[PDB]
Symmetry: none
């Protein structure tokens, strides 16, 4: 009741949030200020918070910035207005937060997730505002809810690095219905996909090649060309055969080698990523890749180091849950279409990891997409759609 | 003074300039303060000066820093004491000066060359200034013309080409490049150094079309793979029958991000040859290798000259004259023609080649290793003063 | 009526045919004897024949053997028992035959196709016997037919070379319902696929690299390494990026370069093939390939020659026709399943070219597959199924 | 006769053997008829013979033809007149013979070497037979031992290794390889040929897993791509500071069919070096290159030795002795030590190295260009007969 009204009594806050978080955008694992601000507000609304290491498994964190970068980002946050009461809980690259609202009334646990990080050289993640927005709506109308509602603010989504660490921490082991959201720019403004399935499994990794000269003196017979080794690696990688079961990808997006024009290269670096339509296919591609870089290093009798930088799996939304999401989304104002599933360029999202987990444990889950192409108020329709998903839940059945 | 006295009454000023230029060292193409000081001093001695653009052809410059870097250095040089009267002539990466002493009497045009730059991340200039002082003091005992070339960007063999293209050595009869040899015995003086291989240094920028690695791989045009294939092709270039040659892809940088098809790729390459012809063969092969690799991926490519130098073939008659004079010079132990040593490069060779090509004589002198400077000035001064105005060479 | 009986009164002939044609197997474009034998028998049954150049467009013949090979194969056929009355009509690599049965009774034209060639170094094509088999059944029961029935015996199916030449000759420009058959070894014995859609479009081509020394004397500076050029080509080819619209393939199956160990290679040969799930995708792959071989040749300043060796398109069976085929196949004895469409390893078949043609002109078509895996009498079930397809045609509707 | 007469009374037989061996020429490892004839003749002269397996280590043979080819040639040799008494000792690719003449008196062991094979798609044997005749006729004027090595597969440098491994030259004090030089002046005689680079010839077979190109590309393991990448790596092998070296992938064959992922690939490679050490460096690098390329595709690889030879360092004292004798030989114009010429290979070098390694002297003699044979026999005969039984070398 009066949800439509209350919403217009919140919109002015959300835009303020999208902008402030756009103003002080932070990269993967360095979302210190953002998490501090989110925690602050969420605690202010009376949510039971869980922070940092309690929700982010230290070990499974891939592609973390160096010890130095984590430090300045932390300090800059403290010098950026980040609340003192919370900031400390995220030091060391553990900027993450899960808010819990327990109604006391027996019932299922509904989880909604949004990422907080921006991109490195931040148009891509206005999702944090929608997360706070939904939190508010969920308090005012708390009385009509049952079971438990969980709000997940995930770090390092770019590069698919954060989800795994939150899953390893057990953040979604007690979730019955999972829903990840996204402001799809490549999606028609006014349209809403309730079953994002265009996500490929993937593996991110860097390869370091070292070719220490066999002896000093700089004699050509002692050189071990790391550059040529990575060059042959790059070719091998891209030559990996496709798979019969579905689409697959491989991309050496970055390569750095050498120190000087006249100097025989002894060091080289490759930034790679593999992808497959299914978990198995991507696993296949990654297996070959390792054989390719290993042999390439051997050719030049050079050494190599493999560094796992991130990973995600394939998405298979729960049919029933997507139906429910479609049914609710149709009534929402700005929603012109429900689509269910769409045909768009394939990509990857670590939210899939949380979905896979919830699904293996009996729950259901899906990835919602809100169109905006050809419109920064799409947050209101996202908020109402999500809020509606909870309030309208068929508690009995 | 009579000469020996003059040199001892000059030695102080010489270390003063050395200390100064060392303290205020400047990288290739950024020798603004040095060039200014040199010009101020030479003008004072009464030398006619050709500066900057008049002695450095713009288009022939290689491995030039970007505008921002040129401007910062120019401003820094002003703030470090560069004589404001001369500073403007070098603005834009044209720190170069040719000082001329025309005796007025008929005779040959003798040229001496020193470089002014230092390494990135040459006590030669002082020597050049000292020699300028002595030659003025004894202009009466000279004939013909005396030319002093102060060259920029010798490191990376980047500056000599532009001076040659400006005509700097086209009127030269006898040329002598001066260098302080660290890898040469404390008392030795090589008068015909030729341990220089011809070379070409260049960059290759490959430009393709970026695309999302997972979403639309068909829209991509991989510049990275083009560079990789070029790199392999470059190192497979066949040797040459006439002598040693080498190709090296020292640096490769490519790509924007892990999930984006690389649309930009850069190769820093170096070509070497025992002779000019051999180096030209290798470089030619290299151009075909990179054009093809770019075409393989439908990528565009741009080849940027970063450096160049040729082989050194010292004029025997001129070498002999220099050796004879050097021998008599006090602090000298061994006045040799050439001396064994690992091969390297030096663009002074372009001036030599040019001079020899027009009928003149040329050589490269090396003073081993400071007091090497007094010896170098006295020696070079002898070379000029004891010239066979009549008999010749 | 008594079709089931008549069939058992023909089986002894078919096995005799499969074996004789297995005995004297001929490769692509050299099916001289086979065509002579087929024509002979078909003429004996009273079919209106069209042979050689009248059914095989000379120009569009790809991957033809050399002038010499065509000669001996021809003579060996004459010395192999090939009928004299017909053999001459196939000289020069035009071994093909289309038999026509016109009932005078107005009606649609039904076409059935089978290939005759074996494979080169012949278990793969017992399809010619089934073709003759069906011809017989179609005569005896001629009275119950209407319109026109056409039987197509295609050469050079292996390597996808013959179909194009028959299409260019107009062989299927007047066909209303087209059906290509195949003894699917990779298909369950007793099963019949009425809608083969597992076929990818493809392009076959050889690349010849020439690197004539710039000068005599054998000086290394004059060499132009064709081997290294093809080597880099091979890598480039296999590195061609996949396509978002569907699966694609590239394979450099053969490479020959050099004349002697110590001699700098001046010549090289590549045997390649591209593939795509759709016509467009394969076209995309072939476009890249040409850029790859051209640039590779340039790197070593070598020359190159592209030779088109064959091609096929994607298969999209006519839904309605597949339904009809399924309905008829179900009643046939040896048929346990109808399936309609199956999931098997992708391949290529030039019969697709005839299908595409017939479909663009208003007719319908499909590719039938008869299982046999885990059974050399599958010809009887194929014959009856095909014969039934004709006899049962809904002439009225 | 006294010698000069003997040679003129022998010349006929010599052309008879030359004409015969030319007419019945045989390829490497297939010298069955030749070896038989040689053995029959030498046995007749009273020479002790070590044949086949006793002088050719089986495992050390390189570039051996397949069984079928060995058998066909063996049978063909029988049908062409090979003396049936000796033919069996060479069955299986062991056509080799070492003839020994032990004077019984104390002295040095002198060895002379000739090859018997011809090219595929050596009038040396006759020379060897003639020298055997003369030395027997004058055994009385000889001391110590005389050994005559008739070597198989000299083409492609394939046979010498197996003889060295059999111990054939371990008891040799003075070794001399004989060769007819077509690229040498009609009257010149090089006594210390050393225009031979060390070398290694080998094949690399890459074995992967075949699969249908379109149906199941993931089941494939491309041996073709492995060879391609190896080929590129092989031609990128860095040079060596101490001297010239070269790598060449002369042949590449791979694949079964257009629509099948290649599971078989073959590279025929050649490695060269100015010295033994330099060739070993290149070959070592080459082994790493091919093992890695095989690993890149999870393919197996097999490296087969097809040939090998080392550098030639003729013993100066022995060269001088040969030159002195050759000079006096009638039909000789120029008895030189070495002579400029393009570099090639010759496995005789393995016997030289071995001999020199055990304290003996060795050299390679070349007779320029037929009547070269009479001169070669007379010369070689002098070398043996005029030996400094006392004074020495
Ligand atoms: Na994001
Ligand atoms: Na310098
Ligand atoms: Na077939
Ligand atoms: Na030979
Ligand atoms: Y309302
Ligand atoms: Y019946």
């Amino acid at each position: 009741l009066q949800l439509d009204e209350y919403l217009r009594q919140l919109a002015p806050s959300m835009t303020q949030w999208r902008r402030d978080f756009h103003l002080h955008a932070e990269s993967g694992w360095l979302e210190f200020r953002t998490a501090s601000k989110v925690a602050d507000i969420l605690d202010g609304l009376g949510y039971q918070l869980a922070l940092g290491r309690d929700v982010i498994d230290a070990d499974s964190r891939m592609g973390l910035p160096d010890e130095e970068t984590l430090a300045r980002a932390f300090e800059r946050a403290r010098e950026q207005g980040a609340p003192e009461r919370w900031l400390p809980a995220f030091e060391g690259g553990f900027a993450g937060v899960v808010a819990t609202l327990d109604t006391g009334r027996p019932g299922p646990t509904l989880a909604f997730r949004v990422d907080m990080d921006a991109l490195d050289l931040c148009g891509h993640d206005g999702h944090t505002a929608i997360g706070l927005g939904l939190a508010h709506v969920l308090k005012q109308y708390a009385a009509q809810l049952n079971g438990v509602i969980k709000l997940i603010f995930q770090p390092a989504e770019e590069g698919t690095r954060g989800a795994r660490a939150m899953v390893a921490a057990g953040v979604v082991d007690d979730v019955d219905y999972f829903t990840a959201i996204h402001i799809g720019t490549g999606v028609p403004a006014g349209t809403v996909v309730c079953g994002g399935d265009n996500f490929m499994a993937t593996t991110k990794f860097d390869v370091q090649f070292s070719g220490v000269a066999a002896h000093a003196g700089g004699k050509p017979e002692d050189g071990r060309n790391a550059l040529l080794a990575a060059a042959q690696a790059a070719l091998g990688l891209h030559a990996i055969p496709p798979h019969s079961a579905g689409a697959s990808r491989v991309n050496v997006g970055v390569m750095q080698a050498g120190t000087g024009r006249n100097v025989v290269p002894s060091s080289a670096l490759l930034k790679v990523e593999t992808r497959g339509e299914s978990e198995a296919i991507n696993q296949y591609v990654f297996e070959r890749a390792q054989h390719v870089v290993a042999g390439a290093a051997a050719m030049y009798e050079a050494r190599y180091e493999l560094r796992m930088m991130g990973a995600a799996t394939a998405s298979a939304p729960s049919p029933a849950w997507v139906d429910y999401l479609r049914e609710q989304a149709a009534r929402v104002p700005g929603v012109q279409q429900a689509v269910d599933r769409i045909a768009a360029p394939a990509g990857s999202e670590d939210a899939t990891l949380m979905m896979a987990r919830v699904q293996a444990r009996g729950g259901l889950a899906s990835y919602m997409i809100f169109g905006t192409e050809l419109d920064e108020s799409v947050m209101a329709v996202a908020v109402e759609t999500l809020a509606r998903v909870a309030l309208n839940f068929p508690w009995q059945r």
